[PDB]
């Protein structure tokens, strides 16, 4: 996982098709 240990998950244009948080 990557952008999924905070509150939203959509931190940039990469946390969409990899981190299930967007």
Curated annotation (Swiss-Prot):
PTM comment: SmIIIA' is a putative isoform where the N-terminal AA is missing.
Cellular component annotations (GO), alphabetically ordered: extracellular region
Main location as per UniProt: secreted
Tissue distribution: Expressed by the venom duct.
Entry keyword Secreted: yes
Keyword Protease among record annotations: no
A GO molecular-function annotation: toxin activity
Keyword set, alphabetical order: Amidation, Cleavage on pair of basic residues, Disulfide bond, Ion channel impairing toxin, Neurotoxin, Pyrrolidone carboxylic acid, Secreted, Toxin, Voltage-gated sodium channel impairing toxin
Location of the protein in the cell: Secreted
Cysteine amide: residues bearing it: 22
Modified residues (Pyrrolidone carboxylic acid): 1
SS bond partners: 3-15, 4-21, 10-22
The family this protein is said to belong to: Belongs to the conotoxin M superfamily.
Domain notes: The cysteine framework is III (CC-C-C-CC).
Misc. comment: All peptide bonds in this toxin adopt the trans conformation.
Known function: Mu-conotoxins block voltage-gated sodium channels (Nav). This toxin blocks rNav1.5/SCN5A (IC(50) is 1.3 uM), rNav1.6/SCN8A (IC(50) is 160 nM), rNav1.7/SCN9A (IC(50) is 1.3 uM), rNav1.1/SCN1A (K(d) is 3.8 nM), rNav1.2/SCN2A (K(d) is 1.3 nM), rNav1.4/SCN4A (K(d) is 0.22 nM), rNav1.6/SCN8A (K(d) is 69 nM), and rNav1.7/SCN9A (K(d) is 260 nM). This toxin is very potent but weakly discriminating among sodium channels. The block of these channels is modified when beta-subunits are coexpressed with alpha subunits.
UniProt protein name: Mu-conotoxin SmIIIA
Organism: Conus stercusmuscarum
């Amino acid at each position: 996982q990557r952008c999924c240990n905070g509150r939203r998950g959509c931190s940039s244009r990469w946390c969409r098709d990899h981190s299930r948080c967007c």
